[PDB]
Amino acid sequence: QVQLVQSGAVIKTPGSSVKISCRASGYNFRDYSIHWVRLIPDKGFEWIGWIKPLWGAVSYARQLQGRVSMTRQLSQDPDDPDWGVAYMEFSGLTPADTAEYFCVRRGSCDYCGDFPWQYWCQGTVVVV
Amino acid sequence: VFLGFLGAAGSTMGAASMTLTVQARNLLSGTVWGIKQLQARVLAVERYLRDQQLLGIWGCSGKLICCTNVPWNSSWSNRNLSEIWDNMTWLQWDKEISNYTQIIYGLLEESQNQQEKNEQDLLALD
Amino acid sequence: EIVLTQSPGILSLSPGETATLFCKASQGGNAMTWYQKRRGQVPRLLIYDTSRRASGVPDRFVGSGSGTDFFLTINKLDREDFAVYYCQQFEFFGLGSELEV
Amino acid sequence: AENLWVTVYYGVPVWKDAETTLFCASDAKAYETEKHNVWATHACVPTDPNPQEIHLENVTEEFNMWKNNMVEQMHTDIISLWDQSLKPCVKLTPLCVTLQCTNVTNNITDDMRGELKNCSFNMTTELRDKKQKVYSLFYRLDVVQINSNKEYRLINCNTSACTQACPKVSFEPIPIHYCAPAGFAILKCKDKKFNGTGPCPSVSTVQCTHGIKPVVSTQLLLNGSLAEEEVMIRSENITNNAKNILVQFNTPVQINCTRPNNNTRKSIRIGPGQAFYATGDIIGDIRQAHCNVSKATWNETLGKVVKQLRKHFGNNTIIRFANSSGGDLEVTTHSFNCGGEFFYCNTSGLFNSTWISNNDSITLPCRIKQIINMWQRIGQCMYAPPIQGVIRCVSNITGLILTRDGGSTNSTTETFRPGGGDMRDNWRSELYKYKVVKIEPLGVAPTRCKRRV
Amino acid sequence: NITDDMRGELKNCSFNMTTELRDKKQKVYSLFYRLDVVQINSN
Numbered sequence: 078q079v080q081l082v083q084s085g086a087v088i089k090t091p092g093s094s095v096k097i098s099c100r101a102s103g104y105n106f107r108d109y110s111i112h113w114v115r116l117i118p119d120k121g122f123e124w125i126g127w128i129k130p131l132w133g134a135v136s137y138a139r140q141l142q143g144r145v146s147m148t149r150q151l152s153q154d155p156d157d158p159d160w161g162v163a164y165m166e167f168s169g170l171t172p173a174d175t176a177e178y179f180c181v182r183r184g185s186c187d188y189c190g191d192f193p194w195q196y197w198c199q200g201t202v203v204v205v
Numbered sequence: 206v207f208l209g210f211l212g213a214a215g216s217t218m219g220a221a222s223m224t225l226t227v228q229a230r231n232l233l234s235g236t237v238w239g240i241k242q243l244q245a246r247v248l249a250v251e252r253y254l255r256d257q258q259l260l261g262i263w264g265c266s267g268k269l270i271c272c273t274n275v276p277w278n279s280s281w282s283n284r285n286l287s288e289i290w291d292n293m294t295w296l297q298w299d300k301e302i303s304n305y306t307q308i309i310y311g312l313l314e315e316s317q318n319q320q321e322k323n324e325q326d327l328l329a330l331d
Numbered sequence: 332e333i334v335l336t337q338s339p340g341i342l343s344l345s346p347g348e349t350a351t352l353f354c355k356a357s358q359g360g361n362a363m364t365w366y367q368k369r370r371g372q373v374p375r376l377l378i379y380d381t382s383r384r385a386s387g388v389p390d391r392f393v394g395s396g397s398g399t400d401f402f403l404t405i406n407k408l409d410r411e412d413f414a415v416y417y418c419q420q421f422e423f424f425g426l427g428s429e430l431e432v
Numbered sequence: 433a434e435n436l437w438v439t440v441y442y443g444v445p446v447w448k449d450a451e452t453t454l455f456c457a458s459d460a461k462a463y464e465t466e467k468h469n470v471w472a473t474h475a476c477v478p479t480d481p482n483p484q485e486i487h488l489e490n491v492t493e494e495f496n497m498w499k500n501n502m503v504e505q506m507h508t509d510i511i512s513l514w515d516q517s518l519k520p521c522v523k524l525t526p527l528c529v530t531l532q533c534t535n536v537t538n539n540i541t542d543d544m545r546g547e548l549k550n551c552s553f554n555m556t557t558e559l560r561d562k563k564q565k566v567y568s569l570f571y572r573l574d575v576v577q578i579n580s581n582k583e584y585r586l587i588n589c590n591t592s593a594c595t596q597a598c599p600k601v602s603f604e605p606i607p608i609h610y611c612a613p614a615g616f617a618i619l620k621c622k623d624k625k626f627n628g629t630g631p632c633p634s635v636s637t638v639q640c641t642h643g644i645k646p647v648v649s650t651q652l653l654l655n656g657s658l659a660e661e662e663v664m665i666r667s668e669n670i671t672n673n674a675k676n677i678l679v680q681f682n683t684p685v686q687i688n689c690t691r692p693n694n695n696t697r698k699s700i701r702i703g704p705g706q707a708f709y710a711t712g713d714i715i716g717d718i719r720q721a722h723c724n725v726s727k728a729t730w731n732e733t734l735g736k737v738v739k740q741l742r743k744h745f746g747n748n749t750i751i752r753f754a755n756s757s758g759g760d761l762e763v764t765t766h767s768f769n770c771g772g773e774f775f776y777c778n779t780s781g782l783f784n785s786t787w788i789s790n791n792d793s794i795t796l797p798c799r800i801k802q803i804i805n806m807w808q809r810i811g812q813c814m815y816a817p818p819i820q821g822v823i824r825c826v827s828n829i830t831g832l833i834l835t836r837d838g839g840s841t842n843s844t845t846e847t848f849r850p851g852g853g854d855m856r857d858n859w860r861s862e863l864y865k866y867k868v869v870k871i872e873p874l875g876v877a878p879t880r881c882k883r884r885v
Numbered sequence: 886n887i888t889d890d891m892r893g894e895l896k897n898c899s900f901n902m903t904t905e906l907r908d909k910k911q912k913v914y915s916l917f918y919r920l921d922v923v924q925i926n927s928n
């Protein structure tokens with residue numbers, strides 16, 4: 078079973094950067110993109126970007142470019158080599174960035190596209 | 206005239222029923238790579254024999270065109286002769302009769318053995 | 332960009348009834364995705380490719396639509412179905428419809 | 433007469449869409465290459481002296497290149513084929529050792545970092561009893577600082593094992609044909625304006641595909657077959673930024689590449705039978721690997737893609753070009769093989785533009801590696817032996833794998849960036865013309881005919 | 886802290902193991918069942 082586990086909630090001061098981790102397991106980590114999305118109070122969901130774990134290629138929402146950086150680390154455990162961690166760092170925070178941040182992954186069926194997110198991390202609340 | 210293998214794809218089922226011996230022709234003859242070759246070489250004879258299997262459990266080992274004794278259930282198509290032989294194409298026609306092809310085959314299976322069990326009785330008395 | 336407009340904002344119905352929720356996209360021709368978010372819970376994928384149900388989603392959830400007009404239908408409402416529902420196409424999202432008792 | 437009877441037909445022209453194991457075809461000159469070098473050319477069947485592709489008149493066929501198999505099959509064949517080649521090739525197990533490295537003999541400006549580390553190390557001997565301190569030259573990318581000595585290690589030592597490719601092998605991409613079994617056809621969209629998905633009016637059956645050589649390369653794809661009329665820009669979902677864009681050129685843009693250093697190779701006896709090919713003295717100047725393209729033609733061809741792009745994003749739109757956002761060296765740079773060594777060419781100079789609604793060349797620098805980790809390797813890696821002498825290759829650019837920025841905001845300024853990552857895109861780029869079908873010849877239909885008694 | 890009668894079936898074993906590099910070594914410990922080991926022969 079696919080599992081995405083994020084790092085805990087944090088309080089950040091304006092001007093700070095926050096680095097959120099998403100430990101992904103139960104599937105081959107290199108085979109699926111991870112997206113990040115934020116749910117903002119009174120504004121709804123905002124897609125942040127995606128990362129493809131093989132080369133760590135990335136794409137960032139135009140309106141957030143310059144403030145977001147996504148990276149990943151692949152398991153270094155010889156008997157458990159297929160999981161990995163995705164990281165998203167979000168900088169120059171303001172109170173308007175107070176939101177719940179999710180890492181998400183698509184379904185693995187034949188008609189599953191890139192954006193329907195079947196799997197969700199438990200979310201990370203960031204209060205600025 | 207000679208079109209080529211599958212050339213009468215978009216031709217009428219009458220005109221396509223001319224060039225049958227061309228599609229029937231190019232159908233047999235024509236270590237990483239070595240294994241690919243082998244399970245392709247068997248696949249082609251398996252797939253080929255499965256058709257001869259049918260023609261043989263019917264009476265149509267002739268073969269190409271072969272008439273039979275099972276009458277056409279109008280429910281299957283119900284279209285007139287002209288509008289399928291001088292009109293429709295086999296690509297098209299296949300999808301209509303597709304819903305009952307295996308049911309149709311069953312009608313054929315019983316009908317052939319019925320012929321044989323009968324013809325023995327003729328040569329028996331005569 | 333795609334603008335997704337969901338309606339109604341709030342839908343008030345009883346257990347056992349059928350809810351219909353709407354999502355109108357500013358651009359036609361794309362398929363629609365729906366999510367359920369129960370209060371305080373992680374969002375859950377319900378429908379993708381307009382009408383296909385996601386993993387473990389019961390058949391009383393029915394997605395449909397065409398062009399710019401898309402619908403989520405929830406048959407025989409269960410107590411758990413009262414939640415906020417969001418539509419999505421690519422990176423774009425509706426602002427959500429709340430189904431209340 | 434009114435009563436109709438079914439009469440069966442054998443040899444009916446009709447097919448069902450399929451998947452099946454195909455097989456390879458190559459030509460006689462590939463075996464004339466000898467030298468025990470080309471991969472799988474030997475087990476591979478030959479081609480046809482007089483190939484024929486029968487055009488099928490009056491028929492249309494719904495192609496989809498983003499939901500094809502024979503590219504997944506090919507991608508796989510290439511990975512396997514390659515991996516079977518390395519079994520005999522020697523293991524560099526003991527080369528994973530604490531190196532003691534310095535810089536190469538040079539007088540460069542402080543700003544210019546040293547990319548050639550002269551490393552000495554205790555290597556093994558033909559006899560278990562002894563050892564041997566011996567030196568070799570390594571690129572900065574093939575080593576990591578381990579920790580007032582300046583000591584390093586081969587970068588693979590913590591990720592994976594290492595196996596030295598046999599120099600008696602070749603990396604040259606030679607044309608492959610994918611031939612079908614019997615009672616299986618391949619259908620070829622002969623329409624010269626096809627985007628890869630939907631009904632194709634001009635179609636032809638054919639046994640084998642064309643000569644598809646396996647150029648494995650990021651950013652720009654090279655030496656491929658090019659479009660007949662327009663620069664076609666193909667994608668699965670263009671509106672969605674998450675999906676890449678496959679640009680297929682109309683005109684070839686020739687790009688010359690080289691390693692200027694006259695490198696030398698010495699052979700070190702691991703023993704017995706095992707033998708490591710070290711990098712010996714650099715004869716002559718210490719220069720920088722690079723590639724040149726005409727600024728004129730790049731201007732011209734980047735103008736063609738823009739004319740095409742505005743058909744999808746509006747006539748009154750700005751379309752500028754930017755360099756990679758960030759990621760692995762495998763994807764942040766134009767990767768390829770050239771003469772037997774692997775290149776990593778900075779594409780910032782190519783993707784650095786802007787386009788409004790209405791005589792030298794481009795020197796672009798490169799890096800070079802020897803221990804490579806292609807196809808998203810995890811447990812195994814491969815040391816590409818030093819290729820003695822000076823190296824230069826000349827190639828055409830056939831396409832691109834571009835990527836658009838999803839920030840959007842309905843701005844008429846959506847920019848593009850070169851991408852890569854998944855290598856199926858490359859075979860997707862050449863196999864868009866093809867589709868595999870299962871032949872079903874047993875037709876049944878009514879004609880006024882009963883069989884005799 | 887078991888009664889003398891009850892024999893120890895979990896032996897804590899330390900040993901010079903190999904490293905990623907041929908150059909070095911590493912003393913590291915692991916736990917083994919009594920059946921997976923034999924007394925070799927006041928250590």
Ligand SMILES: CC(=O)N[C@@H]1[C@@H](O)[C@H](O[C@@H]2O[C@H](CO)[C@@H](O[C@@H]3O[C@H](CO[C@H]4O[C@H](CO[C@H]5O[C@H](CO)[C@@H](O)[C@H](O)[C@@H]5O[C@H]5O[C@H](CO)[C@@H](O)[C@H](O)[C@@H]5O)[C@@H](O)[C@H](O)[C@@H]4O)[C@@H](O)[C@H](O[C@H]4O[C@H](CO)[C@@H](O)[C@H](O)[C@@H]4O)[C@@H]3O)[C@H](O)[C@H]2NC(C)=O)[C@@H](CO)O[C@H]1O
Nearest residue numbers: 684685686687688724725726727729792793825826827828
């Ligand atoms: C630049 C880049 O990134 N691209 C590379 C690319 O360089 C390369 O492919 C090369 O490209 C270059 C440039 O595009 C080519 O160079 C050009 O080539 C021609 C050469 O002309 C040819 O034939 C000439 C002979 O002329 C006549 O004579 C014949 C024999 O006597 C006869 O049959 C003919 O009729 C012909 O006409 C008349 O002339 C003769 C006398 O010669 C007369 O008696 C007859 O009666 C006729 O009147 C000969 O001159 C030449 O050698 C060649 O064979 C040249 O015209 C170009 O020269 C001009 O420009 C040069 C710089 O551009 C400049 O220095 C000169 O001063 C000239 O103005 C030019 O060289 C080239 O052929 C081609 N190279 C190769 C290797 O194929 C490829 C290769 O990898 O990659 C790209 O990426």
Ligand SMILES: CC(=O)N[C@@H]1[C@@H](O)[C@H](O[C@@H]2O[C@H](CO)[C@@H](O[C@@H]3O[C@H](CO[C@H]4O[C@H](CO[C@H]5O[C@H](CO)[C@@H](O)[C@H](O)[C@@H]5O[C@H]5O[C@H](CO)[C@@H](O)[C@H](O)[C@@H]5O)[C@@H](O)[C@H](O)[C@@H]4O)[C@@H](O)[C@H](O[C@H]4O[C@H](CO)[C@@H](O)[C@H](O)[C@@H]4O)[C@@H]3O)[C@H](O)[C@H]2NC(C)=O)[C@@H](CO)O[C@H]1O
Nearest residue numbers: 726727728729730731732734735784785786791792793794
């Ligand atoms: C910038 C970028 O990213 N883009 C690159 C791009 O640079 C490149 O394509 C190039 O672009 C540049 C800029 O867009 C081009 O430069 C401009 O070119 C013209 C040059 O004018 C041309 O002809 C001039 C001669 O003028 C006359 O004379 C002829 C011969 O005598 C005659 O037939 C004509 O009638 C003509 O009219 C009159 O003038 C003569 C005297 O010259 C007179 O007696 C007659 O009676 C007429 O009155 C000549 O001047 C010039 O060499 C060229 O041949 C220039 O006008 C521009 O110069 C101006 O701007 C310069 C900087 O922008 C500035 O330095 C100057 O001071 C000027 O104000 C300018 O250079 C360029 O041609 C083109 N380059 C190439 C290589 O093709 C491509 C290439 O890869 O890629 C893009 O991505």
